Amino acid sequence: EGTFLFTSESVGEGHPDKICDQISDAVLDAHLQQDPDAKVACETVAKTGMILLAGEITSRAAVDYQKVVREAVKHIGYDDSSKGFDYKTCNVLVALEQQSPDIAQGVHLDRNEEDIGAGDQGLMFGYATDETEECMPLTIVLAHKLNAKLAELRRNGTLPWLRPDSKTQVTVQYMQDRGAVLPIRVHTIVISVQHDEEVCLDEMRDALKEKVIKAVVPAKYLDEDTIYHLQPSGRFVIGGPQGDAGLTGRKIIVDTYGGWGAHGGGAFSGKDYTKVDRSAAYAARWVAKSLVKGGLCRRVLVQVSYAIGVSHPLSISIFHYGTSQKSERELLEIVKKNFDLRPGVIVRDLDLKKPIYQRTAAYGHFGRDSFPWEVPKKLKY
Amino acid sequence: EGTFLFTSESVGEGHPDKICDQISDAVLDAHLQQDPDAKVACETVAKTGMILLAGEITSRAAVDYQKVVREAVKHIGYDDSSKGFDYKTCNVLVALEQQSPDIAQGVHLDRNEEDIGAGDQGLMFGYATDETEECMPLTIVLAHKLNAKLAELRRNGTLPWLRPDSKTQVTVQYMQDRGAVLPIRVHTIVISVQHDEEVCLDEMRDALKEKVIKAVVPAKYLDEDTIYHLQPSGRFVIGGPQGDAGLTGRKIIVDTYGGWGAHGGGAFSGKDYTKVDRSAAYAARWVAKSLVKGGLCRRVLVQVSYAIGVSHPLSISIFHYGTSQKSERELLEIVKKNFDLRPGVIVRDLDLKKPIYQRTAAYGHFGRDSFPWEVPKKLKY
Numbered sequence: 154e155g156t157f158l159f160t161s162e163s164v165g166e167g168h169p170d171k172i173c174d175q176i177s178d179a180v181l182d183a184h185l186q187q188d189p190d191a192k193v194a195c196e197t198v199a200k201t202g203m204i205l206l207a208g209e210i211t212s213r214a215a216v217d218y219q220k221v222v223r224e225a226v227k228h229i230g231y232d233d234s235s236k237g238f239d240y241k242t243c244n245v246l247v248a249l250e251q252q253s254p255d256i257a258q259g260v261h262l263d264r265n266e267e268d269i270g271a272g273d274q275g276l277m278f279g280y281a282t283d284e285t286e287e288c289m290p291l292t293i294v295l296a297h298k299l300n301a302k303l304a305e306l307r308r309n310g311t312l313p314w315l316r317p318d319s320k321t322q323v324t325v326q327y328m329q330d331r332g333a334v335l336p337i338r339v340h341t342i343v344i345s346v347q348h349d350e351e352v353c354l355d356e357m358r359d360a361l362k363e364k365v366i367k368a369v370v371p372a373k374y375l376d377e378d379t380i381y382h383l384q385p386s387g388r389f390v391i392g393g394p395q396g397d398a399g400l401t402g403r404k405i406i407v408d409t410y411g412g413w414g415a416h417g418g419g420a421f422s423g424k425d426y427t428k429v430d431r432s433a434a435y436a437a438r439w440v441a442k443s444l445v446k447g448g449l450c451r452r453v454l455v456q457v458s459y460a461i462g463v464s465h466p467l468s469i470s471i472f473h474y475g476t477s478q479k480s481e482r483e484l485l486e487i488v489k490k491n492f493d494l495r496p497g498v499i500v501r502d503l504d505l506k507k508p509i510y511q512r513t514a515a516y517g518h519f520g521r522d523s524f525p526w527e528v529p530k531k532l533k534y
Numbered sequence: 535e536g537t538f539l540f541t542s543e544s545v546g547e548g549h550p551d552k553i554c555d556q557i558s559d560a561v562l563d564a565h566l567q568q569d570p571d572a573k574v575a576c577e578t579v580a581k582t583g584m585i586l587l588a589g590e591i592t593s594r595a596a597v598d599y600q601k602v603v604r605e606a607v608k609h610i611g612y613d614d615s616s617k618g619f620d621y622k623t624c625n626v627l628v629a630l631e632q633q634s635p636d637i638a639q640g641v642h643l644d645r646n647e648e649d650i651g652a653g654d655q656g657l658m659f660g661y662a663t664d665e666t667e668e669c670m671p672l673t674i675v676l677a678h679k680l681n682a683k684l685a686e687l688r689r690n691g692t693l694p695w696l697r698p699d700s701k702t703q704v705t706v707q708y709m710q711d712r713g714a715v716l717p718i719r720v721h722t723i724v725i726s727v728q729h730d731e732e733v734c735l736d737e738m739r740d741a742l743k744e745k746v747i748k749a750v751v752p753a754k755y756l757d758e759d760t761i762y763h764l765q766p767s768g769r770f771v772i773g774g775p776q777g778d779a780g781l782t783g784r785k786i787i788v789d790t791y792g793g794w795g796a797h798g799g800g801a802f803s804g805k806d807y808t809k810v811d812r813s814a815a816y817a818a819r820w821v822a823k824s825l826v827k828g829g830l831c832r833r834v835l836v837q838v839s840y841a842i843g844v845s846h847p848l849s850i851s852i853f854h855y856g857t858s859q860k861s862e863r864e865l866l867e868i869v870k871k872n873f874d875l876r877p878g879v880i881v882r883d884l885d886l887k888k889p890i891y892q893r894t895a896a897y898g899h900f901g902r903d904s905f906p907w908e909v910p911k912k913l914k915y
């Protein structure tokens with residue numbers, strides 16, 4: 154009574170959708186290194202032997218797409234045909250055009266930077282929860298860390314049968330606590346990871362429990378009833394793009410809160426700051442985290458929305474789940490007094506011309522590494 | 535006090551992401567017409583002059599991809615270079631392989647149909663709300679209907695300057711009502727739609743208000759304070775894939791609840807029933823709607839999750855927002871007694887081998903047309 158199960162998932166750096174996100178952001182970063190005002194909307198598609206870039210870029214930079222793509226794939230670890238994909242020998246195809254002049258004229262041409270219009274319509278949410286220090290749901294934090302642990306043990310050679318494509322999933326039993334949530338125990342863990350042709354299933358399952366799960370999940374959350382689904386498909390030799398096509402922006406829930414809070418549908422990777430799908434979601438996270446770390450609430454969800462060409466949000470809304478003594482109306486006044494959610498101001502507050510985006514594109518965009526949107530603003534009220 | 539704004543969006547049939555969803559489901563349907571057991575994972579990518587199919591299909595069908603793709607684009611309305619895209623003359627590229635044998639062996643080979651494994655891990659949600667008869671949020675219903683109205687007036691020739699690519703966005707002021715939500719008024723509407731080179735902005739804005747909004751949104755929701763952003767970019771002649779690359783599965787929030795409820799991240803289009811991203815989300819909608827139409831709650835969210843190769847969900851969870859006299863524990867017992875959420879049973883209950891998927895791929899998968907997942911189950915308890 155008062156408890157429920159909740160599940161979130163994450164994926165590894167070599168998951169084919171995440172490959173695409175990382176490549177899209179490597180392209181963005183390459184442009185921004187040379188032209189901080191590049192307009193970038195770079196989608197990546199991955200299938201056996203192929204990376205395709207499709208989208209719209211207007212930029213003063215001279216970018217070697219072959220090098221940028223191949224270096225990103227090398228970093229992920231796909232470096233041999235035996236692994237199913239090789240940065241040295243794959244096809245890299247480019248279908249990139251300039252940004253539509255109709256978009257450019259309606260969004261940013263002949264506009265003062267602070268008054269640039271949103272690059273599109275849409276809705277975006279930010280969320281924070283006091284259940285972890287980093288203000289993220291435990292389900293998603295643990296799922297990300299399990300993938301990171303796999304990559305670590307692959308790269309350090311202790312589990313050399315590992316390959317880069319992985320997925321994880323964590324189910325936690327939660328208790329209610331005055332509108333907030335408290336994690337009690339881990340009910341179920343799934344891990345699936347691509348592997349070489351030589352290792353056997355029992356060796357993999359033993360390693361995944363002892364060297365991955367136990368190295369990540371605190372023992373206080375694990376008990377004799379916890380259910381483990383380790384390599385549940387039985388065989389995962391074919392992987393990466395060869396096993397499953399990847400596309401940019403197909404892991405938007407992994408990128409955010411693991412299903413908690415809410416999501417407006419927009420993808421992050423491959424987009425410069427004028428695309429509010431990214432910048433306003435980052436700003437909304439920053440607002441939410443600022444409210445929780447400032448002691449105003451324990452758990453909070455912020456919605457913003459925009460119209461293409463219009464700088465100020467059309468709507469700003471807040472829900473605190475009953476975890477503040479202040480009304481949501483009062484919290485909204487505090488937010489309005491402390492934040493300016495025009496994209497041309499967000500860019501300054503969060504330093505969004507800086508080429509740090511490839512680092513955001515695996516293991517979630519939130520709750521990690523003290524990115525600007527993770528540093529709470531001191532609120533005046 | 536007790537009120538908040540909430541925004542949802544929708545897109546039209548010629549929006550480039552939605553083009554991709556529709557093509558992916560046209561391909562699925564073509565396979566299912568000949569082989570009800572086809573294994574389909576068809577991604578579509580669209581950019582100027584190009585439809586690319588990428589993914590994995592194992593099927594006994596003989597499908598003419600050129601015809602299927604081009605007929606889908608014709609139906610949407612892209613039939614001339616003057617509109618930016620033409621089904622008769624575009625490039626159709628195919629990068630389709632068989633389903634991975636490692637997946638096939640772990641999911642469905644040599645398994646009894648009812649006991650087939652989930653085609654992947656993941657989490658899925660179903661939602662229902664009593665605020666409309668179709669048990670959907672008003673924000674998303676209105677946003678979809680505005681796009682449908684644009685397509686209607688394009689196809690009937692009364693606004694012949696319209697083209698197929700459109701987006702809409704609706705902000706509603708809601709009041710709290712004992713855990714449920716009540717819509718009060720429409721605060722803001724956005725409409726952006728591709729148009730010919732001859733029509734002027736004032737003609738478009740007048741038509742969008744008088745012939746689109748007033749034909750869709752009840753006057754009781756509109757007042758002298760409602761804000762209208764009609765063609766806010768000022769010019770939208772370039773559109774469709776030429777204006778913005780499209781990909782399958784990039785409108786997952788438009789496809790579902792417009793940001794309400796929750797989303798697990800999986801895309802629907804291009805996937806047969808063994809992909810629980812689709813089948814289990816449909817079943818979860820069916821459960822949620824059955825609970826509301828059965829009088830057990832006014833508003834409800836259901837989560838399910840799976841592991842690849844495992845037939846039964848790993849977790850089932852329910853949240854009723856305080857809108858039931860029964861506890862969520864009791865509702866879960868009712869759900870367990872009345873539903874079987876194995877994919878190999880869902881397929882029978884919801885008739886998921888039937889080639890009806892292209893019809894789901896615009897205007898949302900839920901709340902429309904009495905699809906099987908929209909017909910409530912009579913609950914025994």
Ligand SMILES: O=c1c(-c2ccc(O)cc2)c(Nc2cc[nH]n2)[nH]c2c(-c3ccccc3)c(-c3ccccc3)nn12
Nearest residue numbers: 157329330331332333412413414796837851852853862
């Ligand atoms: O706040 C809550 C509470 C809650 C928290 C503290 C309190 O004092 C009172 C109630 C809650 N309580 C219970 C109890 C039995 N079942 N549920 N369940 C949930 C869910 C959720 C759960 C199961 C499936 C689906 C969504 C969510 C959510 C999660 C993700 C996205 C959107 C909503 N929030 N939430």
Ligand SMILES: O=c1c(-c2ccc(O)cc2)c(Nc2cc[nH]n2)[nH]c2c(-c3ccccc3)c(-c3ccccc3)nn12
Nearest residue numbers: 415456470471472481538710711712713714793794795
């Ligand atoms: O249930 C509620 C209630 C509520 C309903 C009936 C009651 O008797 C008591 C409370 C509520 N109340 C208020 C009041 C002032 N602000 N909020 N606000 C919300 C939101 C939401 C709102 C603004 C931004 C973001 C999310 C949501 C939601 C919507 C989509 C996804 C997830 C959660 N639910 N919700």
Ligand SMILES: C[S@@+](CC[C@H](N)C(=O)[O-])C[C@H]1O[C@@H](n2cnc3c(N)ncnc32)[C@H](O)[C@@H]1O
Nearest residue numbers: 169345386388389396397575590633636637654
């Ligand atoms: C299961 S595949 C999706 C379904 C697939 N498109 C098909 O044709 O059936 C989704 C993800 O699961 C992982 N995956 C691929 N092959 C797998 C296998 N043999 N066992 C487990 N997971 C696998 C990869 O991370 C892949 O991107």
Ligand SMILES: C[S@@+](CC[C@H](N)C(=O)[O-])C[C@H]1O[C@@H](n2cnc3c(N)ncnc32)[C@H](O)[C@@H]1O
Nearest residue numbers: 194209252255256273550726767769770777778
């Ligand atoms: C604004 S575009 C996204 C940003 C774009 N990729 C870029 O290069 O800036 C997203 C969607 O908005 C719509 N759109 C395209 N051109 C537009 C215009 N000139 N005015 C308004 N909306 C437009 C189309 O539905 C398109 O798919």
Ligand SMILES: [Cl-]
Nearest residue numbers: 168170397654
């Ligand atoms: Cl996936």
Ligand SMILES: [Cl-]
Nearest residue numbers: 235348349350
């Ligand atoms: Cl191998």
Ligand SMILES: [Cl-]
Nearest residue numbers: 273549551778
């Ligand atoms: Cl879009």
Ligand SMILES: [Cl-]
Nearest residue numbers: 616729730731
């Ligand atoms: Cl024209």
